[PDB]
Assembly symmetry: D3
Homo-oligomer: 251 residues x 6
């Protein structure tokens, strides 16, 4: 139950990821063999729930690619449920301030370090109580990544970076650009400056910067600035664009 | 992605609907061909979730009947999820006051007009980014219908009618009668007076009144008073009553 | 595990049925409460399989209405699987002669009376070995109903009626009229005479005649002639026709 | 729709239960025949949702074992949904004080006794309006069991016991031991003393004590002290431990 | 219910296709918007069944791309079921001779032209009896495509082409190369000559040649020779190869 | 893609198995961690199909326990489909003679050694063409186990054992005892002698004997005689018997 993604971040090894929105355990397996370091199972903007997360975790399990799950909100009940099905790395949307970051962290930890509900006999997370001393080992292998998605969050970043248990800070360029007045479109100097400044500041605190970016040149730029978990494409996009380009080549 | 239901309301064309609680994409398709103007996929009182809403939207899509979705609550996270799977007309339960109406509206609109989270690449709503300029076009095709279901809501109706983006106000007779002391049974003069007064007042503000009513005579009465989205039956009821009547005719 | 439908036919008590093509455990339960004596779960012309038959059986179980299952063909493997999930009454399509009727019967019976494969530890049929002496008791509670759907089958009816274990013979008017040259339209005197004569011949042989007929006056006619299992309507038709009629009343 | 579990508690007949976390309508049926008084469908620590609760209720229905459902949280919207699919006995997690206990109760009752939303035509709970006078009969057959899981809840127990409509108070030993500093492991004198004291105090108020305990000797001890709903094992545990022991016997 | 794919082949308009093996109604919709003329829902080499074919048909329905379904075998029972959920164009594998081609055709046609079983009240194919004169109109809109996959089938091609109702003949290069001794590797001159000669012979008989080929230059070659239904890629391959290429660009 | 179960049988290392009839990917994972050498996914007597076999394969994949799949019949089409989702070890029921054994073997092998259809781009079996030279490597890692379940099959055992590609012969005591006139009750000396003699004859031919037996002392006896794949219990039985015993201890 060692969290190898968490360990790679702490060691400064950049992790290249693919976003999964196809909400299918079958395509998840197909993509798990493609060579990524991590895969993001999106519970916020794709039609997933705890049960489909579970089947995608099962599909991914024998492969080297490490799963990360995005809950629909920073909701301790939903987080509890995701952790019991075996989630160990969470990408939490819309974290606006340090109090919210701390709540995300505490939702992942058993008392006294947090408020995670205890239900080990029933949980894939403990392999139904086969993992010895699960209750004592679990807190240390949880990896909490928080998303900053607004001007308010950018302003609070220093305080967020000070929250123990926040392992990574992810910048969401679509939401951030929208909040900044550019309608979800991030290729604007002001948006890029905000993104790049944050990446530097995050890395300077010893924490991992993350981002999703489908432009490969920008992905490399962010990596050069110190980003450590970078998602470089989206399954639905890869499929739709490849199919459309193919059809067009035949008229 | 033009919302034709929204446009019909704005033009004063009454829309006759059927409520869908069978929670099945197969019966949804069968009913989509029956000639209704709109179909209500009930996420509040039927066993639906975001995934079953999606498959019912897919089933309904080639037919002329327009889908409307009822979330389980006025919850911005659930609303975000429903919109990303392609919902454009929402019937929001238990809206008690103008602040709650405004929150329902803002949950449907991208910044700065609202707080809708951006996730277009992943969404059926944008057809996975095939709809050009989706982010700029989407807000205008969202149709927000709010339910008034209590004496408190009836008292706040004038203020609710003043909220921009509230396109329609729906009266729920079962909940309202229960709140008024008649245990969910609306055939009482006091309940009828409250319902009919509201319909007039709603229509007078230039907004669309709506209601569900399985009594056909009352449905016509409400339409005569200016109601514009009237659901005139429920799939589960139509099926159960037809089957029971058939069995009884054979002993 | 007593087969009450089988016992009712044997006692000459007419059983009034409803056909289930909605392929849903949810609507199956709703309909199980409507007062029918039997419900036909259609695996031939509706999108069912062994798994959906199982869930419909579970839904129907606490109600008085008795389930009957139609496999897609007279296939001993498919019959084996349906019996293991708990099916005790089978309506077998396209039985053309006595050899085929005997094959259907033998598929339902353990050796030496048949070729039914043994796997009771695993099966709902034995309640996972909780029913005592299941292997000894099962054969006697199987009820095999065979469909005659062609002129060839009608010619062979006398021989079919002589097969031990054939408890009932069902006439399919749609298939039969098509075979006779009337394109699935059974309201033609030559077709009605063939159906009436069969019903009489079946009843005179001391076996149960069955049929499906959505015309309530024809149903009553066939019951008058001695039909013992008569399905009087179809769920999809009930729902579609009720919905269409309702929409049309509002224009 | 009489709630026989509720009645057994009120009469002081101890009810022996099994916890269901396999989240399957198939194993639920298999276990429903095993001889327990009650079965707990866990929506908090197993991958269930309203739809899987529904299918497990359907599977259990013909058996004598009575279902109890644990929602993921004391959430009135989730409770509304569970009740409409037919849940009549709820085990509510993390009830910390009398206000929260009262909210749990009110979520189960129609106005004016509570805030349960009205949606009877659509609901399995009313058998789609077949149960006569459902709206007037339902409140009295709801059984609310609240979990005390923290030192704070133990301190508030007297006040919780004073809340009308709280039928039972359940002690969760894993969560309680964790909150008390023993990492989810309850075999410590301080934890046992707290548990046994609570059971006595609960029973003294005329309300039903409950607990889950897989140690059979402790289960008997708690029953001797007056516990009335005692779950004595967990499906996932029974299966995993039996399978592991079997494999080990063969090397 | 006009079969537009069938009409296009008959008019000699080349139709460009994409193979669907992801077995998902969700990715089917995403791909239905990509601009292909036809989409092949593979029930032979992907984990589909009648139920998943149905949901993919529903997903594809509002788009211009036309569905074609491959059953697992030339099995009249399976064909009956696929046609009842709405399939109008079938790609039948392993058709070895004229008798087998005639069997495939007859499985799709109502008596007297075939043995298709009648069950239109129940079926999506007739929109649950809403399509007027369905029984009379259906035969003419069925399009049967047969696969020649062996040397034996190639030898019998002239006779196969003479079967009335065979609208198209599809060459499977993987199976054919394997049968000819090149282990599913069709890039060998003896295999390419057999494929080219077949394409020409098919087109000269006034029927439509088809093929699947992921090499875009070979596809263009076969179109130049007269192939009329050409699948140019496979969803799983598009996705896997795009993902793998992306991961590799980041090392 | 090395078949480790096949290699263990060939090396004479006894493999201890558990039968899986719960038809759930969730319980399959729980059981995959219990320490068995092999797990039998039963498609003949449990409600499985190709789709549920796939998800169970995915669940089991990261564990050491090796999957074996039983199709419902010796059907080459069903075998093709099971192999494409990744099945490498098959337990084929009701193999009565050498011709049928050879048919089972040939169904698993690509031409010229068999008739397995080629569709590797699409299949999990090749990891969607990611396994290099899959077409060349696959045949050698298929393991075919045939069931002898009748007196006729026992008579033909010598010839069956002479079929190249038959790696193991499994005796089904339930079916065999039924065929011999002991109604699925194999605890009769004539049945035990037939089973013992078969085990010895199989092992002496240099092939692997197998059996299912829930009596642990008989299992140990058959292992002593040379049986190489022995299933020692069934999931549904383990669960049902553990639950029933537990309930009974509390009365
Ligand atoms: O659980 C059954 C669903 O609600 C209807 O498909
Ligand atoms: O509803 C379709 C799912 O989201 C994809 O399997
Ligand atoms: O995801 C697997 C379910 O939780 C058990 O049926
Ligand atoms: Co975002
Ligand atoms: Co309401
Ligand atoms: Co018929
Ligand atoms: Co607890
Ligand atoms: Co082929
Ligand atoms: Co057997």
């Amino acid at each position: 139950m060692e969290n190898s993604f968490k360990a790679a971040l702490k060691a400064g090894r950049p992790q290249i990821g693919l976003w999964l929105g196809l909400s299918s355990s079958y395509s998840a397996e197909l993509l798990a063999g493609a060579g990524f370091d991590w895969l993001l199972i999106d519970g916020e903007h794709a039609p997933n729930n705890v049960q489909t997360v579970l089947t995608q975790l099962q599909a991914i399990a024998p492969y080297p690619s490490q799963p990360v799950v995005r809950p629909s909100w920073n909701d301790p009940v939903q987080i509890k449920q995701l952790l019991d099905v075996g989630t160990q790395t969470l990408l939490v949307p819309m974290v606006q301030n340090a109090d919210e970051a701390r709540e995300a962290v505490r939702a992942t930890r058993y008392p006294p370090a947090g408020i995670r509900g205890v239900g080990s006999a029933l949980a894939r997370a403990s392999r139904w109580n086969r993992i010895p001393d699960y209750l004592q080992k679990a807190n240390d292998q949880m990896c909490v990544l928080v998303q900053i998605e607004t001007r308010e969050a950018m302003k609070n970043l220093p305080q967020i970076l000070d929250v123990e248990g926040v392992d990574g800070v992810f910048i969401g360029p679509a939401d951030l650009s929208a909040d900044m007045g550019y309608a979800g479109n991030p290729q604007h100097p002001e948006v890029q400056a905000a993104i790049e400044q944050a990446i530097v500041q995050i890395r300077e605190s010893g924490k991992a910067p993350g981002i999703l970016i489908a432009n490969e040149q920008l992905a490399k730029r962010y990596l050069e600035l110190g980003a450590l978990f970078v998602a470089v494409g989206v399954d639905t996009t890869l499929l739709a664009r490849a199919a459309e380009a193919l059809a067009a080549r035949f008229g």
